[PDB]
Amino acid sequence: ANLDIAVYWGQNFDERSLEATCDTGNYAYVIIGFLNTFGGGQTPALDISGHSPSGLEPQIKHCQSKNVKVLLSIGGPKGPYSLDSRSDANDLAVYLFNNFLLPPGHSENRPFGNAVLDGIDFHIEHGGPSQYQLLANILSSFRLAGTEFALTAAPQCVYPDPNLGTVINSATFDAIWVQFYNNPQCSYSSGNAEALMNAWREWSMKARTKKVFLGFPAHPDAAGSGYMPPEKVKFHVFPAAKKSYKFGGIMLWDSYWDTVSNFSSKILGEGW
Numbered sequence: 001a002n003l004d005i006a007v008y009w010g011q012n013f014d015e016r017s018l019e020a021t022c023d024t025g026n027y028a029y030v031i032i033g034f035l036n037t038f039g040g041g042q043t044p045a046l047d048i049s050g051h052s053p054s055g056l057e058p059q060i061k062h063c064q065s066k067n068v069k070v071l072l073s074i075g076g077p078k079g080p081y082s083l084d085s086r087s088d089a090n091d092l093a094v095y096l097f098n099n100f101l102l103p104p105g106h107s108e109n110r111p112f113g114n115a116v117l118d119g120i121d122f123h124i125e126h127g128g129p130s131q132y133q134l135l136a137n138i139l140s141s142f143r144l145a146g147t148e149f150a151l152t153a154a155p156q157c158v159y160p161d162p163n164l165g166t167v168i169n170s171a172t173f174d175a176i177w178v179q180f181y182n183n184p185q186c187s188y189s190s191g192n193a194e195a196l197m198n199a200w201r202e203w204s205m206k207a208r209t210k211k212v213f214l215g216f217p218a219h220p221d222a223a224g225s226g227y228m229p230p231e232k233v234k235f236h237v238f239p240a241a242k243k244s245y246k247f248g249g250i251m252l253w254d255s256y257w258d259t260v261s262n263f264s265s266k267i268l269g270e271g272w
């Protein structure tokens with residue numbers, strides 16, 4: 001096994017804190033969501049469910065000191081975000097670079113203070129491809145300029161993804177976590193994994209990335225559909241998934257629900 005688990009954080013004001021989330025030892029990646037406001041004349045804004053952005057500075061550092069990678073996710077399930085013009089792609093690329101991916105020059109400007117993030121997560125669920133290809137190109141260019149960080153995406157389970165499909169085809173993403181929930185055509189339902197198993201084969205064969213993660217909801221309440229019990233994921237999915245060269249591990253939506261279900265603890269055998 002030796003499983004890598006990625007988990008989304010920032011979805012509830014009352015959730016287990018980021019540092020306690022990393023201290024669990026269950027995750028290789030923690031993804032903070034969401035920068036859900038940008039483009040269309042709008043100034044970029046975060047919706048991290050009321051957590052203090054400045055307060056996350058020491059927590060992000062602690063998480064990193066324990067070898068947990070911290071990512072910022074742009075877009076999200078909901079939000080007034082859009083990248084319709086070329087200028088919007090350029091503006092957001094420059095803003096993400098200065099304020100999150102580079103060490104501060106002087107600055108009082110940065111939301112997370114002096115924390116330097118390990119990457120950007122594309123969680124685009126509406127708006128089509130737009131200028132997301134251009135945005136990724138500039139971010140990819142900065143990565144080639146010496147600032148080492150990761151670019152990831154969280155597409156829906158139908159391939160190709162209507163919003164990120166063309167961008168994923170450029171092979172720019174280091175890792176992809178496919179959301180195998182909220183869509184019966186490609187996720188687990190009614191004691192039937194057929195739709196899920198066929199979606200997985202397609203993504204692991206066609207997705208032009210080095211690592212593909214399987215995204216599951218940590219709890220029945222966490223998503224409309226697609227919840228699959230831990231004992232079934234290990235029995236059903238892992239044997240066929242670990243046969244793939246592109247198998248990355250699993251992604252969990254989300255930290256708040258995982259704390260309640262203890263889903264990651266069961267899939268690993270309680271670790272630690």
Ligand SMILES: OC[C@H]1O[C@@H](O[C@H]2[C@H](O)[C@@H](O)[C@H](O)O[C@@H]2CO)[C@H](O)[C@@H](O)[C@@H]1O
Nearest residue numbers: 046050051052053054055110111112113
């Ligand atoms: O670095 C930024 C800054 O966030 C501030 O919190 C705001 C939050 O972003 C906003 O959405 C909400 O409506 O109000 C809160 C505060 O009362 C936070 O106050 C700052 O400490 C933090 O550093």
